[PDB]
Amino acid sequence: QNSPQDYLAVHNDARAQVGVGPMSWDANLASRAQNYANSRAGDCNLIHSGAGENLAKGGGDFTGRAAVQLWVSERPSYNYATNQCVGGKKCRHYTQVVWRNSVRLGCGRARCNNGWWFISCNYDPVGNWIGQRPY
Structure with missing residues (x-):
């Protein structure tokens, strides 16, 4: 639930569900992401760039798969x-x-400096940028 394929699978699912093309694992992006998470975990705050990331903090058994799934919780x-977000709040993740x-x-x-897990x-x-289309 935290291996490259675990994240990729869920992304690729969501993308498939709206017939959007796939993505690949850069490996270095994964290092960067974990390394950023590793440093920023001393705080825990959902603070990274803004447009071009998807951040998550959970509580305990919080896996990468679960995190992508939490983002896909904005499914409907x-x-x-x-071909837009519904007139419904919180669609700033799935996008x-x-x-x-x-x-x-x-x-x-x-792992955050408060027990919980950062992703x-x-x-x-x-991405999630106004400029071009999400899907």
């Missing part, structure tokens, strides 16, 4: 039938996961 807040523009992927899990997932080109 996306609606490909209208990135599904971000057509990003072809790189790499993610990392680090980061980097993407380039930038």
